[PDB]
Amino acid sequence: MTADLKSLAKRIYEAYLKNFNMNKVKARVILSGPFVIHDMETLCMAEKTLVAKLVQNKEAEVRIFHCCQCTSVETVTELTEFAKAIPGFANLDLNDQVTLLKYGVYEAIFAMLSSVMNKDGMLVAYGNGFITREFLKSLRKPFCDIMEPKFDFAMKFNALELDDSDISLFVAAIICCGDRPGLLNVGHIEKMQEGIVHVLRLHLQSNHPDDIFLFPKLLQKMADLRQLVTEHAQLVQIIKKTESDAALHPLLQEIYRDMY
């Protein structure tokens, strides 16, 4: 790993630490011991302290869904800044930057969600709440079907024991996929992708000498995320169609529009 490549890995890591409010070290410090949301009584208590304005109120499941949409809008914003640290990203055509982020953001979201999940629940609301996995399963259909596949992905992803230095590069690689539909400058993106993937490979070799297959394991996780997002988008479409009170924020509507 040349000084240039080591420096690119550090640039990407620092961009991740600066641009995401939650990092995995911070999340683990908190999860080691937030207000616990495990039932309807504690949901409504948390709403009154953490999202006071939101609480004529909607059904609980629809309130939770609205709050989730707010966090997605914010994460999409954070991922947009972050992507500028990727060599060549800001030099790409504005329209290609849109296409890459369009397909990439939810893969990045579900990868990063793993850092705040354990087998019993997830840290939420900027580190101030913890919602149990069983509570989310108790919601009425279809809302109970949103988070469980994400916990299942996260348990196996977390068993890889990645740190923030690895995850920042993996999120950059997700954004760089040169096989998204609609790309204008596939060739330049493939070269941008190759550069990030090359740094990811070398960094995993340095940082995880104990796991000689970690790079292909992460390529497979990328593919698993793409399929997780496809399925997620299908469920979101069901909710939007069948749930009168579950309208999508316009930014998220645009992200899902014509996605899959």
Ligand SMILES: CC(C)(Sc1ccc(CCN(CCCCC2CCCCC2)C(=O)NC2CCCCC2)cc1)C(=O)O
């Ligand atoms: C919104 C759809 C339509 S479905 C969808 C998508 C994503 C999620 C996970 C949202 N979430 C829980 C946010 C929970 C808020 C909490 C609810 C109870 C009262 C207190 C506030 C959360 O913490 N996300 C992290 C954010 C940091 C970066 C990693 C992701 C849930 C549903 C979408 O597709 O966007």
